[PDB]
With several copies, the nearest count.
Chain A
Amino acid sequence: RHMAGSAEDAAFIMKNASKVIIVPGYGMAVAQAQHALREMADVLKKEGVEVSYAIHPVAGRMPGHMNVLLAEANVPYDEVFELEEINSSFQTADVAFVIGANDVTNPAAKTDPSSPIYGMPILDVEKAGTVLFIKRSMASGYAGVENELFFRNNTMMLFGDAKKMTEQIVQAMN
C-alpha cells in the first residue's frame, strides 16, 4: 500500500538533499521534539543542506503553537516562514520533512467539498521531490480525515515518536 522507511533511510535521503522544508505539526509538540528537530536541522545545515520550516496558520492546537517550541529550541526566525511565503517553494525542494503533522498537509481540503477541512489552505507538500511523514500510527488528526498523501509514489512513512525518530535520524547521520 504505502511505502515505509527506517531512520537509516531518512538519514541518507536528507544527508544527500539540497533543499529541505521541515513541516512541524501538533505531533512534534506532543512529543516535544523541538530540540531533536533543531539538532538535526544543524547537521543538515553543516552538509550544505538548505533548511526552512513551514508553519501552517493552525498547525498545533493554539495560535503560534509551533512557534513557542521552535523558539524555545532556539530556532532562527529567518528560517521560519508562513504558508503564503513557503508554498511557492516545495516544488523546488528535494524533501518535505513532515514531523507530527497531518491535517495541515491534507490535499483533500483543496478537492472533495464534502471533507471537514475543505476550504482550508494547506502546505503543498506533495510538490517536493520526496515527502516523509514522521508520525506513530496511520491514524489521522483533528479532522480525523484520512490523508490521501500517505499512498503516493514519493511518500515514505517513518513510523515512530516524533522525538525518538528525529533522534535516531540525527544519530544515523553522524
Chain B
Amino acid sequence: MKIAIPKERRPGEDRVAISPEVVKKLVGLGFEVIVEQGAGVGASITDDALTAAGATIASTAAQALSQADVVWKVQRPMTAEEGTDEVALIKEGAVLMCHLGALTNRPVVEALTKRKITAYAMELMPRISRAQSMDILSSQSNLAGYRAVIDGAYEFARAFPMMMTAAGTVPPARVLVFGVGVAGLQAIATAKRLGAVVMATDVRAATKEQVESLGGKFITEFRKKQAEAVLKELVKTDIAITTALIPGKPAPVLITEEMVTKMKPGSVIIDLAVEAGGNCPLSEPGKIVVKHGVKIVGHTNVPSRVAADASPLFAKNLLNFLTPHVDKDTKTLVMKLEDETVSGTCVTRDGAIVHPALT
C-alpha cells in the first residue's frame, strides 16, 4: 500500500503535500510513504524529517511514483502541453488527491481520465460541517489573509502601531479590507493586532457582525451611496487589502483606477484576487506596479509565501479527507460512493469523467 508525494514543479510553488506528523498517521494506517528528495525543502521540511517519521525517499517524480496506489500533490499535475508530463507518471489507475482547479482545467482532467485514474478535486469539498476538517480552500486562503498584511506592511513606509515617543506621537496606520471572508477576516485581525485602525466592507452585510467581532469597523441606487461611503474611507487609507473572489468568473472590481488616483500617495494596495482579474484593474499578476503614487501589490500563489505553515495544514486537509476510507483492517481504500464528500469531490474514476459539471 503505497502513498506517494512528489515535488511541486509548477513555477512558484514551494509547498509540499505532506508533513512528518501526517507520515506517522498514514504509516500507522498501513501505508508506505514515498516522497522525492527535497520535495519539501521549500517548506522547511527535510528528507531527514520524513524518514524519521517513517517515510522512504525516492529520487524522481518518476522513481517516486511507479506503482503509487494513491498520490498526494498540492497543485494539479502538468500535462505535456506544458512541457513536463506528470500525469503520465502516475501508475494508470491510481488515486489522485490535490487541488485540480477542476472546473477550469478540462485539458488536464482528460489526461488523467485517459490514464484511467480517479481524481479527487479537493477544491470542490462540500460546504458541509464535518468537511471543514478537509477544506483546502479556507486553510490556505487563511494564511493568505495574514500574508496580505505582512506584505502590505513590508511595502509601506510608516509603522503600523501608534507609538509613544519623546519626539511626540506616531499615529497608527489605517487599513481597509474588501470582502470579509476567511482570507479577509484574518487580514483584519492581524492588521489590528498590529496596531492599525482596521475597517472592512462586504456586500453581505451579514459580515458587519463578524468584522465587529474582530474589533473591526464595518462601512455603511443603493451602491450609488455605498460605493461612495467607501470613498470617504479609502481617501484616508494606508493599506487596501482586497480579497473578493467569485469563482469561474473574473473577480469584481472593488478599486478602480479612477479611485487609486483619488487616494493618498505612499499608500499600498494588496490585490489577492490578482489572478482572477484583480479587484483593481492596475494590479498585474506577479509584481508590484506603481501608479498615482500608489503601489499595487499583486503577488501569486500567496499561500506559498507561507509555504512552511500552509503545508502541514494542506497535508491534514488531505489526511483527513482520506482516513475514513482506509478500511478498518483489510488494509485497502474504499471510497464510499454515497459519502457526501466523495460524491462532491471526484471528477473522474477508473475510466472517464464522473463529476456532474463536466459530464
A adjacent to B, CB under 8 Å: yes
Docked Cα-Cα span, A97 to B128, in Å, equals 28
Q: Check if A68 sits within 8 Å of B195, measured CB to CB.
A: yes
Which chain A residues numbered 46 to 69 have a C-beta less than 8 Å away from chain B?
55-68
Docked Cα-Cα span, A122 to B38, in Å, equals 37
CB-based A-B contact count at 8 angstroms: 94
Chain A residue nearest in CB terms to B194: A71
Q: Check if B162 sits within 8 Å of A71, measured CB to CB.
A: yes
Docked Cα-Cα span, A74 to B213, in Å, equals 12
Q: Check if B129 sits within 8 Å of A67, measured CB to CB.
A: no
Q: Check if B130 sits within 8 Å of A71, measured CB to CB.
A: no
Q: Which residues of B contact A109 (CB under 8 A)?
A: 129
Let me know if A172 is at the binding interface, CB within 8 A.
no
**B144 shortest CB reach to chain A, Å:** 11
Q: Check if B185 sits within 8 Å of A62, measured CB to CB.
A: yes
Docked Cα-Cα span, A26 to B214, in Å, equals 10
Given the known A-B contacts A67-B163, A71-B193, are A120 and B138 also in contact in the complex, defined by CB atoms under 8 Å?
Answer: no
Docked Cα-Cα span, A65 to B167, in Å, equals 14
**A149 shortest CB reach to chain B, Å:** 18
Q: Which residues of A contact B167 (CB under 8 A)?
A: 63
Q: Check if A117 sits within 8 Å of B129, measured CB to CB.
A: yes
Docked Cα-Cα span, A12 to B269, in Å, equals 51
Q: Check if A62 sits within 8 Å of B186, measured CB to CB.
A: yes
Q: Check if A120 sits within 8 Å of B129, measured CB to CB.
A: yes
Residues of B in contact, count (CB < 8 Å): 32
Let me know if B164 is at the binding interface, CB within 8 A.
yes
**B314 shortest CB reach to chain A, Å:** 13
**B22 shortest CB reach to chain A, Å:** 15
Q: Check if A57 sits within 8 Å of B130, measured CB to CB.
A: no
Given the known A-B contacts A71-B195, A77-B172, A120-B132, are A26 and B163 also in contact in the complex, defined by CB atoms under 8 Å?
Answer: no
Chain B residue nearest in CB terms to A103: B129
Q: Which of B142, B169, B189 contacts A82 (CB 8 A)?
A: B169
Q: Which of A57, A68, A77 contacts B165 (CB 8 A)?
A: A57
Q: Which of A59, A68, A77 contacts B197 (CB 8 A)?
A: A77
Chain B residue nearest in CB terms to A31: B213
Which chain A residues numbered 63 to 90 have a C-beta less than 8 Å away from chain B?
63-68, 71-72, 74, 77, 80, 82-83
Q: Check if B164 sits within 8 Å of A66, measured CB to CB.
A: yes
Let me know if A158 is at the binding interface, CB within 8 A.
no
Q: Which of B161, B170, B182, B209 contacts A71 (CB 8 A)?
A: B161
Contact with A along B166-205 (1 / 0, CB 8 A): 1101101000000000100110011001010100000000
Let me know if B210 is at the binding interface, CB within 8 A.
yes
Given the known A-B contacts A72-B193, A120-B129, are A67 and B166 also in contact in the complex, defined by CB atoms under 8 Å?
Answer: no
Let me know if A119 is at the binding interface, CB within 8 A.
yes
Let me know if A29 is at the binding interface, CB within 8 A.
yes
Given the known A-B contacts A62-B185, A63-B182, A116-B129, are A68 and B214 also in contact in the complex, defined by CB atoms under 8 Å?
Answer: yes
Docked Cα-Cα span, A61 to B132, in Å, equals 12
Ranked nearest first, the 3 interchain pairs of A and B with the lowest CB-CB distance are A64-B163, A119-B130, A62-B185
A to B CB contacts below 8 Å, 18 in the list? A29-B213, A56-B164, A57-B164, A59-B164, A60-B213, A61-B185, A63-B164, A63-B166, A63-B182, A64-B189, A67-B163, A67-B164, A71-B162, A74-B215, A82-B164, A117-B129, A119-B130, A120-B129
Residues in chain B within 8 A of chain A (CB atoms): 128-130, 132-133, 138-139, 142, 161-167, 169-170, 172, 182, 185-186, 189-190, 193, 195, 197, 209-210, 212-215
